[PDB]
Subunit: 157 residues, 2 copies
Amino acid sequence: PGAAQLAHLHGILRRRQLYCRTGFHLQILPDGSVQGTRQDHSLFGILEFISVAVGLVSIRGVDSGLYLGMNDKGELYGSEKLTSECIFREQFEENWYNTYSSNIYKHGDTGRRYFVALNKDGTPRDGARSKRHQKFTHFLPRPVDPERVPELYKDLL
Amino acid sequence: PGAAQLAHLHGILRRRQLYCRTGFHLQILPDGSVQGTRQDHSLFGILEFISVAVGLVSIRGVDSGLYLGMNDKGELYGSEKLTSECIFREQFEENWYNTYSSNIYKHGDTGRRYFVALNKDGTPRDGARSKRHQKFTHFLPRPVDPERVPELYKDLL
């Protein structure tokens, strides 16, 4: 084909599963909420990673179509349109587990950044109360076996 | 396009990096040898996973073009053509780390299978001397960021 064809396929090559070290895969539901499923290959767990810049990413739910974004008060959510709240800093942490902080939100005084995180029960943790050294913020990007989520792969088809 | 087009692309969607728990990415060199690099996104570290059957896989080096295979005496190597020695049993182990044993080789007496493994210094370990509970055999499948290995992605292009 052509035009936007090249970039579009690569997005599909960049689809991942974000497994949080507390035992959950980050998912972005259609209603706009963000949470964690213990299920491998969840349909909303299939996230497409857009490499914005060096150390920067944007995570779009392939199924929900929404972009992961963190707001003013540290709360995660699914943004229907890209915004400055949707760009996160991707930093290595330990063992291929990355950490993802807001690219615009931090604690004015300490300078400590706000982090994308999930509690041990799976619900979204308050970005501001989450820290780099805590396991709530560790996220291992995982590969997506397309044959396990066919609905999401009828673009090439 | 057509004919074999559908299956071909999916192979590209199933390219992975096999990170061994002892600190290395399994690579398949052109000379036919198998070893481990500490380098993320090594050019020979980019393996295409062929899901043979349930719990079965075949690993082909994208760059070397060779298929990972284990022989009679537990030694890994890069097979130029598929053989019975190239099919491995993929089993979950802990934390998304899988274990890969020979689908035809085991210890006649104990019944303990032969495992794909790398020592802590990175060289290939003897399949027969490797065990499931040992970290030499733990392998975390990782995603491949195409933009980091362009040479290997000129098929779609």
